[PDB]
Amino acid sequence: EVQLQQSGPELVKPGASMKISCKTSGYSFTGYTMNWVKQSHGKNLEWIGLINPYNGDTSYNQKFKGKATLTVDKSSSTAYMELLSLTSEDSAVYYCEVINTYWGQGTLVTVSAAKTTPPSVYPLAPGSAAQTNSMVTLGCLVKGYFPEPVTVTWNSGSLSSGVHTFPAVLQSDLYTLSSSVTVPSSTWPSETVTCNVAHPASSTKVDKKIVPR
Amino acid sequence: EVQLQQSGPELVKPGASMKISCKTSGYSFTGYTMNWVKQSHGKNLEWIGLINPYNGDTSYNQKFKGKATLTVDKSSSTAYMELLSLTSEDSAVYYCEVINTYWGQGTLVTVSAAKTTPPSVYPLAPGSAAQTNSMVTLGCLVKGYFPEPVTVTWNSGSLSSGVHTFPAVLQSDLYTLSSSVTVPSSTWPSETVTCNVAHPASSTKVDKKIVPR
């Protein structure tokens, strides 16, 4: 029952420092090497370092030697990875994993001197469709938000089949994302459909009910 | 790939001696304890003895101490169990097994001063049935044979579903057995049906084609 929880998403400015937590549950904290991995700029994997929770024994690589340091608190059973002198290339997903089988959730780090912007959520329905076969598509568009990521669900996760959440794309230093669901005509508009968009960086959770025009 | 083959069925007279073989294949003969088990008078299991093929080391029980002896030939990789002073209670199925997982075929031993009798094979078909639903039964009866066992198959084992070979019963020092097969009306009499009865003790193999009367 090994479980690792990281400190969610993060957003920092170039030239600052940050901390990443690796809270552990289900086992005695001392005993595992607690390796760290960084993945960014697509699907590029590389190693960061390892620290022994028992008594120090840090082992890094020359690429990250001095860029980051690891600290261990045996009381809370959490790791406290510390990042110094961040730069645009340090926007990465950081994983903390113990024995190369139990991986962490992953912490997303964005290093940019931008501004946090609340998302713009818009429902989209086939108004005046004139074609109502028993497969009709309706969507929810999130435009102009920062930073990543956001979670878009439908009716609080009740509907899981036929969902499509397209990846966000950057434009004018603002990410855009879309969600789409295809449901039969026996559903629309008989049952309520509502898109829920949650952005934890802006600490916002909006709910939009889609309605025909 | 451990395989053990015994010396088929046997028939002896009271007061004689016999030999049972346990030919082995798929492993080095020396190394296994080669335990022996006797089962008779229903489903009663008991232990006979064990012999080390490497260098003697026989271990029996006081019940069978002196009744039977074990001899080992390392060249042929076969056991040579020897039975002395047989009696009507010694009519038994003898199994030779190595490590309590790989059992033998089983040798049937009948100790009686009887006479070997060839079986009487009779086909039985619903002559003048006046009822021909697409489930019709036909049988083959083996009467007055000795000793056990006999093998009754249908069309050289081509038909395996819907077969019923009833256990033999003794009467006037002669065993009787029956076989029955239920096949749809789309089969009888379009396809050939023949019952094959094999008795190795009498070294007979008869084939009887069933025909409507």
Added chain:
Amino acid sequence: DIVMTQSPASLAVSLGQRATISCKASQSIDYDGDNYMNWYQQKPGQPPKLLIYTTSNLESGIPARFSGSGSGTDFTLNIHPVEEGDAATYYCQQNNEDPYTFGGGTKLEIKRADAAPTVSIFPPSSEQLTSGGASVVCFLNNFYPKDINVKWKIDGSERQNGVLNSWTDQDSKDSTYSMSSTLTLTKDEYERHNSYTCEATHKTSTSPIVKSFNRNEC
């Protein structure tokens, strides 16, 4: 000397229900700190097949449906998911004292829905008839439960002596039984009567099923 008396007389369970067997040691069979109790499964016409070798931790190649437990002078073999293809006999061996004695043996019967017996009547064959005797046969197929009584009727009166019954083991495909009743008779008395009848009274219904024939009808 260490005779073990397991005491399931006969066990009959349906699909999915537990099957427990309760082999019991004799006096103090726990030598060397633990029990080396072995469990063997033997299908009719086949040698016994081992499932558990030391009281638990069944051998490889056997489905995990078989479990062993117990200690001292009380041992238990448990089969929780009783499936279709297991209706064999279970034995317990000690492998601990001077004799490697086995258990008394418990028959495992799979319970299933009751069915009506398929009844078929066979008059004696002509080849056997000219040989000097005759034998009329009655086959019951795919019936449940095993308990059933079949009677033969000659010219208006039932006959008991001269009737031999053969019961087959529980099949591993439909969990139903088959029976073969045979009435043998010398040729002296075969032509002295005309009607030959086989009737079965089974628990599947209140109607005794009857199949008969006549000598001159053939």
Added chain:
Amino acid sequence: DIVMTQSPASLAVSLGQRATISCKASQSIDYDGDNYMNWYQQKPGQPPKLLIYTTSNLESGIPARFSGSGSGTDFTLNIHPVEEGDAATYYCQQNNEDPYTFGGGTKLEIKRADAAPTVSIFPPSSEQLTSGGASVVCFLNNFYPKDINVKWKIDGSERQNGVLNSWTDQDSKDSTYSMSSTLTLTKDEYERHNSYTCEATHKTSTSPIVKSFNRNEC
């Protein structure tokens, strides 16, 4: 310094066919007599999942469909029964020298029968319209293969700039893709044109599928 360059550029196989990945060591990575090559499977949006830790003998909890082989500077990961639910990325790690570097990464694509794209057109919402801008959206669902080009048509002429496309990963339920094309436009030019059209030219057929609407039609 021991950079490893696996060289499957992109692998696309159908059900049941073999999938082979060919991670290669750098110079002499066979320390201590054997190769401690690790294989990781990473689904999109999920952390990598280990399958094999030392070149073979995959860990428990993983189906035996994954096998490892090789030595010296040549390693191979084989998946013979490629099933429906495995379309992730495969990585190779050395765990042998000073840096624990990973492989270049190979994308595994499950081949399936070609399908026609389900096309849907969404005009800009009224709430967004009054905000100062507009965005017309075109959704393609359950199409194969991934390569496809979607164009937008304004009042009789196609437009390229201002169009953004988003491709979804291969789904783990039907092995088909989805695409979202968005044409954004300021409110100044939105009412200067009437017809808005989205057309797709896919390999599934020779007919370019077209869905259009009008501003005054709403």
Added chain:
Amino acid sequence: TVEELKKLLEQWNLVIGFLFLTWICLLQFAYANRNRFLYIIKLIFLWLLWPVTLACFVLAAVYRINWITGGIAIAMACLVGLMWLSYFIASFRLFARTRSMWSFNPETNILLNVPLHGTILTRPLLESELVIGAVILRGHLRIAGHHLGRCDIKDLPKEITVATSRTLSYYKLGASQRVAGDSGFAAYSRYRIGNY
């Protein structure tokens, strides 16, 4: 009188030092370095060490008073002798039970019969236990610390462990797990015990 006692006593000291050096060079870098002919020399060195300490004890009570404090040196000798004597009888009982000839080993009186491919190989164990481990490690089978030679994952499903008094147990291979290359982690669990 000093000269002959001198020669004899530093000769005894130097031979004692030589046997010390033999033990040191045996244990330091050759403790378990593929003990094929070295296990036998270990056994015989211990066997000849028994009379070494017996001789030391008997010689410590012939050149001093034997009633006030030196009488311990002989009283301490006799017990060793009986221990030594007990050794033999135990081994004799073992040599009465089996015919392996691997008895008379100073470590313990327990025999391990492994019917490896070919004939059966006998090794001296240390104690009889329910679970016995085995490793391959690049085609070199090692059961309970004894190197038995070339082997693969397709091991022997059964091996015997016999004690002296009233014990002759059997072990069956189970859960044969394979490690990268050809290394293995085969098991042996006791399932049958034969008395007498």
Added chain:
Amino acid sequence: TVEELKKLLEQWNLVIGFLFLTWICLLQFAYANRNRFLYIIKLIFLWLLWPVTLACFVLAAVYRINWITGGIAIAMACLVGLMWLSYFIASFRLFARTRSMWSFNPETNILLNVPLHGTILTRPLLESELVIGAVILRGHLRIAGHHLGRCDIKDLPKEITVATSRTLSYYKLGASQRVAGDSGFAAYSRYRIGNY
């Protein structure tokens, strides 16, 4: 002159016999009898046996000629010394790499860190191998021959084995098979190696 040399030399002989008896009573019936405080006395007895043979060698070359044949006794001493010296430096290097304090063990210079429930326990191994075995045997974990105390089948999935020069390997538990009662046959396969 005979009296004092006499007293000294049979005193040396009797103390040598006493250490022989200590070794015999240690190895005969207490070779691996739950070595909780007895493994330490084994280690210290070997550690004090090193200077015993060193003293025998140095004393064999002070009471006889030192040029014709006795000069071996000192030439044979010095090599032991350098071996002894090498011992220390090896252990020192190990004590430079880790802080377990379980170094300075005469058997080998290899450490086995088992993070059993609670803190990490360090034991001295004999050689570093790909496969490491473990048994339970009625709730008494024994990894590579070292009794580590009460344990069950729900073992620790990882343990470290560190050498001195350039080796620090990790082992991951795999294929945890269970034996009747609570006995187990857990495995450890090496998967990661860390240099320096």
